[PDB]
Amino acid sequence: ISPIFQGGSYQLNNKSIDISSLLLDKLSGESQTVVMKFKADKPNSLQALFGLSNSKAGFKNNYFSIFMRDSGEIGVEIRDAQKGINYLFSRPASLWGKHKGQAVENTLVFVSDSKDKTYTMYVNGIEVFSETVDTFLPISNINGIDKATLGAVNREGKEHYLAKGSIDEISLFNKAISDQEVSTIPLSNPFQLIFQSGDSTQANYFRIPTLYTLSSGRVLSSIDARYGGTHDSKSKINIATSYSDDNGKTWSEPIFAMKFNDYEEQLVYWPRDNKLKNSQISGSASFIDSSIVEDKKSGKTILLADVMPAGIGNNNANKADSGFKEINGHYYLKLKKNGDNDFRYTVRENGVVYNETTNKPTNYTINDKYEVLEGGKSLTVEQYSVDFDSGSLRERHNGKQVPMNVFYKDSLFKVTPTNYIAMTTSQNRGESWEQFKLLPPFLGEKHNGTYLCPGQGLALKSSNRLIFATYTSGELTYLISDDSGQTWKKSSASIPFKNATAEAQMVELRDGVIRTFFRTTTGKIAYMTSRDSGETWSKVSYIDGIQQTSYGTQVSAIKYSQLIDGKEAVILSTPNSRSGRKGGQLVVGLVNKEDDSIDWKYHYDIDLPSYGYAYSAITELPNHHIGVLFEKYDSWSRNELHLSNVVQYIDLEINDLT
Template identity: 50%
Template sequence: MSKVKKRIIMSLLSTSVVAIYCISDPIIVKGQEVEYTDAIESTNVSENANFITINNEVENNNTNQSMSLENHLDKTVQEDNNNLDSTEKEYTPDYKIENVELEGEGLDITDELEPKIKAGSHTFIVKYSSNTPNNLQALVGISNNNTGKSDNYFDIFQRTNGELGSEIRESESKTNHLISRPAAVWGKNQKNEPVTNKIAFVSNVDTQTYSIYSNGTKIAESTVDKFKPINNISGINKYMLGGVDREGNTAFNFYGKIDLFEIYNQALPEEYLKEKTQITAPGKLIYKAGDSTGSNYFRIPVLYTFSNGRVFSAVDARYGGTHDFLNKINIATSYSDDLGETWSEPKLTMAFNDFANVPLDWPRDPKGRDLQISGGATYIDAAVVENPQNKEVIMMADVMPAGVSFRDALRNDSGFKDIQGKHYLKLKKEGDSDYNYTVREDGIIYDDRTNQKTEYKLEKDYTITKNGEYLEVEQYSVLFENNSKKEFHNGEMVNMSVFYKDALFKVAPTNYIGYVKSKDFGETWSELVLLPPLMGITRNSPYLGPGRGIVTKNNRLIFSSYTGKEVVYLYSDDNGQNWSSNVVSVPNGWSAETQMVELAPNVIQSYMRTNNGKIAFMTSTDNGNTWGEPKFLDFINNPKYGTQLSVINYSKKIDGKNVILLSTPNHTNGRRNGQIWIGLIDPKNNTVDWKYHKDVDYKDYGFSYSSLTELPNGDIGLFYEKFDSWARNELHMKNVTPYMSFTLKELIGKE
């Protein structure tokens, strides 16, 4: 939106037709943005949704109506210029200081700042880099430094794990407000240099709210009882950068550089602060809160480089927070044709419509964070492979009917029936007590009691038609009122899927695996195909190991999956037309999310998550038909519950040897300390020498699920969860799945 209002000339042509003349400037009309070109635009406003409908405003004579509408638009544009598109409006700080380097001593700015800070609301903006990740460092501190008043202070702090927060404390009133979010800032970049972060803190007396922004994202907000304005803390007499003066001693010492510190005696607008705190970060966000996916939360990253040089990504778009189950989850995809510099607009490639795709701010407080969407049909945990024979891309995912979780899925039911040696998807009709129907050839739904066709058909997208007409159900939405969750029908009718809880026919409440295919490198995709019951008619499907499949030298396609006591290799020897399974027992209780690499022709290694904190690996020397006993990587130590990992082949030799790469956390206190390990293959005995490794960030920074790929130029792409996705206090955080890339020199310290 331009700051200067352009000339708008309007004339009323009839009670429903308006001519608008505007010179290349969008305007806002009743909350809708309308873009006009240099040409004169004329439209019937009752027929064009982009224009305000004014029929109820044009009931009197045309002259009055024309003047009224012109005045209305004049007023609207003027109001918009005043509010501005707050990202364009500039604000003048009441105090500003730049280029302060500190080594733990702090800088007293009391004389300069005290006369300038006023009563009321405040905004603090800090641009800084820390070169020593201490446990707790204060960027700014305002305090009462008298003896016995050590708890009278305000600070903005960061911790060694990337947490950013603020405290507002006063002993007399027993005020102790803490607002913070983990995984809020960057530590170091690909070259091991401290990253410059830019953050903002807002104390808003009008809304009784404290808010924090970091690097373009609003990361936390808290509306509190007994709100305490910063300047109302009793006895304030010290203002510091890089620490808090507590009883004459500098606490929470900061080490690094403060490039910029500003204070405003007002609460600046949200959109302005999101823009103001943007930085050039070491990583990019392919998927962002509130983007075209309609989701605020993302998990389970997937990365793959296609044969045409396109870098492809997929991710879980999660609508009910970051929960696995129960939730509403779709698979979103995006791709880059310029080595990961820019990415296509994300789209929902595997998606259900029983719940609206609307960004929800899921509660993060201990009481509200465990709330879940009760019944969304879900796609989860994608894995991708490209078949080099036909350039066809296959993407698999777990498919969960509404209300079915990992815990609830029937273990003794595949969801299919065996009829004369053929497997058909079985269905239960509303009101029945048994699965009396199956989906036969051409999608026709049969009544198995009579072996006769019904008037119903299952379409290729698993929606139901009756005599050629689509059946519909009313969509659900979710909202929060008075700290409680409400699910309700929203009035939107969508095609009825057999995976929806309100469907006339429903699949069995177990888990399935399905796949889609692309013949144009991820731009368009086929309809979903469910895998048949590869584990047998009386067993549910295994669960996919998210990430990527592999294609062996003899063109076998393999995806990995698991059951909790088995690794299940899903393979095809006919270009993905038919699939078989190879079940390999592992110790009971292993999550066994597995990723594979081919060390040599017919030699495959599988690396997997366990329940003992170790990464296990198994080797096959016959193209995956049989497998050796599990062994462990002795240099990786994670919590017992473990974490998914990524492992890929690398095309270049290092130290004269073929190479594989592995990404994983390596920390016993949570999913932290992300590392990329470089393994050199010994072809004599199919062993790997893990000779080099690269720390992605500081050791206490979060790092959970990840996916690696080799870029066309030989650099390494990494798409990962930059937070501890297991920790309860790190649930439901926005914009924490970055993509970044490393040169070979950055990984191993040499070309």
């Protein structure tokens, strides 16, 4: 259908605009759609874009509004005191403010549907909430409505929630337009999605993005596909990948690099209310924090991630146990059989399950997929699915059989409940991934695995050396391979922090000179230098001019291929904020050849200082543009859990940054 009202070019400069005459007598029936294209690059703390209100004395709480906060949150109120209805629906981190210095035109579609009794809000082509009520309140059936307002809500004759911004276009319909119709509405998005709700992963959530430019020109991305909301392990999480062959313009349908099947891949709407938001999938194995590198020699792409057995995460993981047994220089994965109180088994060569107490091999083996066979026969377990139908999280058998994996809850043989690191490879640049292998322990039998630093590994330009940064208590633990990832050794580098999340990323400043940038607990990003291709490491210094929070955020970093102002350049991606994960920046540093010091010369604001920015991935695209895939929200904040489609991709050119 056609609009009952259409207007545009409205400037909201802390003064509402009255459109009652144009709109109010046009409103008919109980279903309505609002389409609004608007900018707000300097919003007030809390402002209404649009209001329908009873402006009369004593009816202060009879109004409908669409509002935003300077945090990027969008929402509506629907209030009628006589009906005793006070609805408030919102979602944090739903907006853009600025991109390349220009105010972004956000496209907002609000659907109020009386038939289904459902309020739905889309912003920039993304559904940010969909709420069904028992008692539906049509937005123009509020008792005594006498004002249609842009840029405030008229309450008792006064302007509340005054807006600063602009409404380039607004349309209203006496209909609840369908989801299909909504998707035909043109957008002006500064971003694109690579991974997204309802894609092949069937994860409703994503965190921990990576990007890496392959020598063929293909750009590869990996990510945590997180099923049970955005929580870290314990949970269900798979590692998914996608690639672009056109400098980031389009991206392939995701496939999995690393996945478990003990729990179904369910797209779930995880509750965001305070009572249930901490619900956490508690019986699933998971992969988490991935990192990618390309090997020049073999041509293989290599992907590593942390591995968590069923119900295990960082905080309940057995520290002081690697999960392996050392038997004369060699490390064997320990296993516990159903009913035993201790681990009386190991996995030896060719997957043979060997008994330790009696030193006998068994009739059981472990295949390449860490699945259990008896006498060559695939054993199985039953899969779980999750639901909240009872009003709380339930995890229950779903009737499907899947191969029995030693990382599973219901497995006959079970690994040590601790964290591991796994690796997989692709020979076709991410079109398919091999079965993963556990890396061996690097810090002894009685030490849990280090934690992979998410993002990129480092492929040294003048050799075959591959390095993946990892961290644990008191140090960075660099993993080093000179033979295409077949064998690894560690290079330990002490840092002056205990129990930190020292997520580290590396750049090669020049041949064999590696600078590592890492997260700390001090409010500053730290760094250290190696001048022998990672054999030895300097003491720790800190960057002034960038602020992080006390808890810190992952920093991403690349060496730019081109000179800038005649100098070698490095580019860091990080939130710049001592308050939260917001104020995204790319910071361009120029290297001083005298001493390899870096002058952080240019700061590019990704979006508003108050808009969310968390974990990030950056890569130099083959055309020398910069690709950025990032968490566009505060992934620390307890108020911004379980948001969909907040990991987003943008394309920039160096001139944008300078």
